Nucleic acid binder design. Structure first.
Lengths: 131, 102, 56, 272, 86
RNA sequence: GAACUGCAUCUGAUACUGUUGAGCUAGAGUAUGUGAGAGGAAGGUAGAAUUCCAGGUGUAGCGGUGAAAUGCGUAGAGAUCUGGAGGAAUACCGAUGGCGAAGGCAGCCUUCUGGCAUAAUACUGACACUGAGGCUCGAAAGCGUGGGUAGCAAACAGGAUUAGAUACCCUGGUAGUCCACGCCGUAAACGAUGUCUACUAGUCGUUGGGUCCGGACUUAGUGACGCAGCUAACGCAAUAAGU
C-alpha cells in the first residue's frame, strides 16, 4: 500500500511538471502544506492553497511554474525515505547543486531550507532535494 | 426450490400415462408440495428414434418440493421403465404461463 | 428478450441444415444470447426435439 | 478395514487383520447353532480325498435362511455377527412373529434396517426378490440356481452379479469370474453386494495363521521321489516334465469340464 | 448455507450497537458460524481444495480480527473468545 | 592549536520517527439486492464415432505407401445391413472469449461448495502491505495397492529406404493414459517481466455490470496500435520494462 506521503507529493509534483500541468491537487496534510509553503517561499511553485472539503478532508492544490518553456523544478528527489531515514547535523546538511538548489530540512524549528538552517546553526531530517 | 420436470413416455403406455401423473401429484402434495403447472403436449413426433420407437408421448409439469422428495421422485423415474427420459431442471422462479407448444 | 429450450420454432432458424449450431459471425447474435441459445439447443437435443445430426 | 501390525516380532511384521466394530461381539442365538465336527478331509472309508485339510479350531454351524420362504413379512436386523464357516458376515433377522433367522449380510446394511421378502417389495440391499421383478442393471447376490432350493451363487464376501438382460424365460447374468449363464426367471435373487469386501486384502502373516483356519502344509512334487509324484526324483533341483497332479492329470491349462447338460446353460466365457 | 434468518440472528446476538453489522465481534461470530456450517460439507468431500482455500482465508480473517480486538480492548476479546469457544 | 566524527551525564527544542490518550473516514473489511462464468467436489444420464462379438445379402480383393512389403482374405475379408457388449473424449457452439493464486478448467440435469463484479444505504474505524523459516496447492511422466482396459501408444516384433537405420514411413503392439486411495514435488511451471500502492496524451476493439438520452458517460478485468519517458538495441508504453 501507500507507505509514503511526502514521496507521493514529490512524485505528483514531478509528474505534473513533466506533463506540463498548470496545477496539481492531492489529499492535504499539515506536513504536505508546510513543504508546499517552503516551495512557494523558495519560488519553485506559484502558490499552494488548501481547500477544506467534506468529511473532514482537505485538498492541497499547487500551481506550477514554467520558465522559458521548461519546468522551474529541474529535479525533485526524495532523500529520507521511510525505509532509510537520514538525519544530519548543522555542518553535515548536503548542499544541492553547490547551493543553487534547496535541501528541504525538517528541523525542530519547523520545515525550512538548508541555508536557513545553516544560518540558524540547526540540523534535522534532510527530507528532499529540489532544484 | 422449484423443479421443472419433462417426461417422455412410451406409446403403449400412453393410455396409462394419466394415472402415474396423479400418483406423482399425490406424492408431491403429501410432502408440502405445490404444483404450479401441468402441461400435456400430446403425442409429439421425435426427431430421431429412441429405443426403436419413432413417436413418443410428452408430459411436463412444474413442482415445488424438498430435495428428499425430489430424490424419491428421481428413483421412481429411474424404476418406472416406461419413462425412458426425464429432465428435472431447477428454476429460480416458478413458471405459471402456458407453454408455447401447448 | 428471453430464450427457452421449449421454443423449437425459434431454434429451427438458428440451427443449421444438418443439425450444427450456426455461429455468431453468421447469425449476428450477442455473446450472452449465443451462450443461452447453445445451452437451449443442447437441452432440446437431449429431449429429442432437435436432431443431433441429419443422418442418425 | 485393513489394519497393519507393528513389527515387534518376526511373525508380526506382516500380519494384517480386518477390523469390524459394528458387528456384535456377543455369542449368537443358541437354538440356531449346530455342532460341526471336523472330518480332517477324510471320507467314510477314511482315505484322504482332499489334501491339506486338518487341525484348525472348532467352529459352530449357523443355520442360514437361504430360501427366504417367509414372504410378505417385515423383518429387522437386530445385530450383525461374524461367521467362521463363511467369510461373509451373517445378519440376524427378527421377524414380526418373533422368529429368528440368519442371512448373508449385504455390505450396504445397517442395524435396525427393514427387510421384506416376496413378490412385492422395495428395491434395497438385503431384500430378496424374483428375477422377474428385479429390474435390469441392478447389482444382485445370493442367486438361486433351482427354484426353491435356496441361493447358491455369490455367497462369498463381496460377491456381485449384474443382470445384463432378459431373453425368453431366462435372465442373462454376468458373474465376477466373467462367465455368463442363463438363469430361470422364477428363481429369486437378493439386491446388493455382499459384505466384508476387503476380506481379499488381508494378510495372515505367519504359518500358524493358516493352521488356525485348518490348512495343513503343501508339499511340492519336485520335492518328492518318483514313487510319490510325477515330479519327484533327480540329482539336485529339477522339474523334468509337463506339470501335473499326483494322479497324472496335467495342471497347466488342461480343461477338465464334463457337463453336457449345462453346456446349453453356459452362454459364453470371458477371455483375458 | 447460513440462511438469511440465522445470519441476522447471529448479528442480533453480537450487536454492540444498533444495526452495526460491522464490529469485530459480529464479524468474528459470523465467520465462526460459517466455519461451523462449512465443516460438515468439507468433511464429506475431502478433495475440495478450491473451497478449502476460501475457508482458509476465512480463518485468516477471523484470526486478524481477533488479534486486532485483543490489541484494542482485552476484555472484549476474552469475552468474545469465551462465548465462541476459541 | 586543530582533530581524535565517539561515550555518560544533566539542560533545552517538538517538524519527523518510537511509546501512548481522544477522535475522523479517504486504505482494508463487514450486512442486505442482483448478475457472469469449462471455479471445485459427488453422482446420474444423452448422442455421433472406433473396437470386438452373433447373424443376412456377396465375391476377390482389402489395407497402406512417393513406390511397395509385413498384415487381413476363398476357413468368405473389405463394402452393406440388423442386433448387442465395453472403454475414453465431449465436434459444431468456440471467439489474442470466460473462471481460477498458480498448476489448470469444455456435452447435459441434480446436490454441496469457495471467489469475483457491480447497486444505493447502514456499519467497525488503520484492523494495512510485504514476508526469513514454516505449511497448503502444484502440468506431464513416474511409483504402490486395487479395478477397468475401445482408441492411441513408450518398450518389443516384423516390413521398408539406407553403405548401415538400434530412427523418420509402415503392419501389429504391452506398460501408461481411465477410476478409488496415497506417494512423487519436478516443466520453456513464461508475460523468460515478484507482490502492493499513487501519478503520467490519445485511439479503435472485446467480455461482465451500472447510469443516462441506437448512441454518449462511467467501473474491475480482457487485447491491437501510439506520445512524453526509459532501454545496448530490440522494444515497453495506464495490463510500463516510465516517475
Amino acid at each position: 500500500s501507500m507507505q509514503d506521503t511526502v514521496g507521493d507529493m514529490l512524485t505528483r509534483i514531478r509528474n505534473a511538471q513533466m506533463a506540463n500541468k498548470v496545477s496539481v491537487a492531492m489529499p492535504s496534510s499539515k506536513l504536505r502544506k508546510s513543504i508546499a509553503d517552503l516551495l512557494v517561499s523558495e519560488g519553485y511553485v506559484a502558490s499552494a492553497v488548501v481547500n477544506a472539503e467534506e468529511n473532514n478532508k482537505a485538498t492541497l492544490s499547487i500551481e506550477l511554474k514554467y520558465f522559458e518553456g521548461k519546468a522551474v523544478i529541474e529535479t525533485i528527489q526524495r532523500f529520507s525515505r521511510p525505509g532509510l531515514r537520514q538525519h544530519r547535523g548543522k555542518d553535515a546538511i548536503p548542499t544541492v547543486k553547490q547551493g543553487m538548489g534547496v535541501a528541504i530540512v525538517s528541523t525542530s524549528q519547523g520545515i525550512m531550507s538548508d541555508r536557513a538552517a545553516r544560518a540558524a546553526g540547526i540540523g534535522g531530517e534532510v527530507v528532499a532535494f529540489v532544484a | 426450490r422449484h423443479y421443472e420436470v419433462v417426461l417422455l413416455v412410451h406409446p403403449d403406455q400412453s393410455d396409462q400415462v394419466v394415472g402415474m401423473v396423479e400418483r406423482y401429484i399425490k406424492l408431491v402434495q403429501d410432502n408440502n408440495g405445490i404444483i404450479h403447472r401441468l402441461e400435456d403436449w400430446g403425442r409429439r413426433q421425435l426427431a430421431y428414434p429412441i429405443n426403436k420407437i419413432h413417436k413418443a408421448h410428452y408430459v411436463l409439469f412444474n413442482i415445488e418440493t424438498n430435495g428428499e422428495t425430489l430424490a424419491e421422485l428421481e428413483e421412481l423415474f429411474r424404476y418406472n421403465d416406461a419413462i425412458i427420459r426425464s429432465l428435472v431442471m431447477r428454476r429460480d422462479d416458478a413458471i405459471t404461463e402456458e407453454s408455447q407448444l401447448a | 428478450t428471453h430464450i427457452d429450450y421449449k421454443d423449437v420454432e425459434l431454434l429451427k432458424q438458428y440451427i443449421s441444415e444438418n443439425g450444427k449450431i450456426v455461429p455468431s459471425r453468421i447469425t449476428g447474435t450477442s455473446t450472452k444470447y449465443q451462450r443461452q441459445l447453445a445451452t437451449a439447443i443442447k437441452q432440446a437435443r437431449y429431449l429429442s426435439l432437435l436432431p443431433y445430426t441429419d443422418n442418425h | 478395514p485393513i489394519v497393519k501390525a507393528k513389527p515387534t516380532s518376526p511373525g508380526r511384521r506382516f500380519v494384517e487383520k480386518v477390523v469390524h466394530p459394528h458387528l456384535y461381539k456377543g455369542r449368537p442365538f443358541a437354538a440356531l447353532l449346530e455342532s460341526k465336527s471336523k472330518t480332517g478331509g477324510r471320507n467314510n472309508n477314511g482315505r484322504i480325498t482332499t489334501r491339506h485339510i486338518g487341525g484348525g479350531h472348532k467352529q459352530h454351524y449357523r443355520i442360514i435362511d437361504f430360501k427366504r420362504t417367509k414372504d410378505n413379512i417385515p423383518a429387522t436386523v437386530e445385530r450383525i455377527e461374524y461367521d467362521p464357516n463363511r467369510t461373509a458376515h451373517i445378519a440376524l433377522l427378527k421377524y414380526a412373529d418373533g422368529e429368528r433367522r440368519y442371512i448373508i449380510a449385504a455390505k450396504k446394511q445397517a442395524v435396525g434396517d427393514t427387510v421384506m421378502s416376496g413378490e412385492a417389495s422395495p428395491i434395497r440391499p438385503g431384500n430378496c426378490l424374483p428375477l422377474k421383478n428385479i429390474p435390469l442393471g441392478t447389482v444382485i447376490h445370493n442367486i438361486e440356481l433351482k427354484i426353491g432350493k435356496g441361493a447358491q451363487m455369490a455367497r462369498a464376501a463381496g460377491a456381485s452379479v449384474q443382470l445384463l438382460g432378459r431373453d425368453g424365460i431366462y435372465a442373462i447374468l454376468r458373474l465376477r469370474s466373467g462367465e455368463t449363464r442363463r438363469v430361470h426367471v422364477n428363481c429369486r435373487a437378493v439386491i446388493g453386494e455382499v459384505s466384508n469386501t476387503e476380506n481379499n486384502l488381508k494378510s495372515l502373516g505367519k504359518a500358524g495363521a493358516s493352521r488356525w483356519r485348518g490348512i495343513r502344509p503343501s508339499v511340492r512334487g519336485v520335492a518328492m521321489n518318483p514313487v510319490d509324484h510325477p515330479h519327484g526324483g533327480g540329482e539336485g533341483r529339477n522339474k523334468g516334465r509337463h506339470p501335473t497332479s499326483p494322479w497324472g492329470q496335467k495342471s497347466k491349462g488342461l480343461k477338465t469340464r464334463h457337463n453336457k447338460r449345462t453346456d446349453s446353460m453356459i452362454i459364453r466365457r470371458a477371455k483375458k | 448455507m447460513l440462511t438469511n434468518s440465522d445470519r441476522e440472528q447471529i448479528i442480533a446476538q453480537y450487536q454492540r450497537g444498533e444495526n452495526d453489522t460491522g464490529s469485530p465481534e459480529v464479524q468474528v461470530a459470523l465467520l465462526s458460524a460459517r466455519i461451523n456450517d462449512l465443516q460438515n460439507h468439507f468433511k464429506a468431500h475431502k478433495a475440495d481444495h478450491h473451497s478449502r482455500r476460501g475457508l482458509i482465508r476465512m480463518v485468516n480473517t477471523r484470526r486478524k480480527l481477533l488479534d486486532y480486538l485483543k490489541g484494542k480492548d482485552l476484555g472484549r476479546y476474552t469475552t468474545l473468545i469465551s462465548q465462541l469457544g476459541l
